Amino acid sequence: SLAHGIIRSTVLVIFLAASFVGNIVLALVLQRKPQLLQVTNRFIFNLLVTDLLQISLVAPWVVATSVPLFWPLNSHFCTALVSLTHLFAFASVNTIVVVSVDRYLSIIHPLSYPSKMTQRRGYLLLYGTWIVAILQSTPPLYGWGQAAFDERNALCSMIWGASPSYTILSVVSFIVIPLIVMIACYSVVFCAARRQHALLYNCKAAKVIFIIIFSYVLSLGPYCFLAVLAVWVDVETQVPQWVITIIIWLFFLQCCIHPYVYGYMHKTIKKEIQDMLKKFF
């Protein structure tokens, strides 16, 4: 009902406001000293900026469409909004994959790491991930795929029951490839860590990997689950409101999840953040 949407809009603000300050603190700690690590600050800053841009260019419209005004709207509006949201999510996912690959290439082959990842390669990778996120995303602005308004949830989401090919492409580009790459890159790291632990001391390494995988799955899976289920059965009259509310709740949790998982778990970055926070407070 109206109260349910009001509650959803009210609770959608606190998470985003906390993520905003967390991302700003991370930005300050990462930009104060540019000569940090090696061809990594660029990747972390790219993830941070594609999180902040999504936050600031997505939150106002998503909150304002729930207010009981200008109900008619126009298909073009949410059509362009969903494209922006998908572009930002795809950029974040591709940066995530690149960061995971770099982490695996750093853990394994510790000797000839500098000769394989130069500044030119990092900049080319950043340009490539942005180009892919721009190009491969947003077909429906000109082709297959369409968004529409729903008088049940009124989120003006895209209907997957019209172009199965685009739904399949989004599904594979969302979960399959990133999950496979992450599992393949992390299994070897876990085996090497286990070995090193056995050599040194003649279960700690599994917690971090489990946390990363579980966080990514909890952030991204339900949306793909809903998209896959939409093709067979209807969604307007077959799904309760609370389920859609929880799905749209969990979709935006990645904004707060990413900085904690990838900035606060690093020892040096955590130390410097704590140092700055204690100095200011």
Ligand SMILES: Cc1ccnc(NC(=S)Nc2cccc(C(F)(F)F)c2)c1
């Ligand atoms: C009237 C009514 C009917 C059903 N549930 C509630 N919510 C309650 S008691 N606490 C609550 C507050 C904010 C968020 C949540 C969350 F959904 F995140 F768990 C729960 C209220």
Ligand SMILES: Cc1ccnc(NC(=S)Nc2cccc(C(F)(F)F)c2)c1
């Ligand atoms: C307060 C008020 C008074 C009069 N009209 C509106 N706008 C309406 S109904 N739809 C609308 C909203 C945003 C963009 C567009 C677009 F131009 F892109 F089609 C259309 C709002």
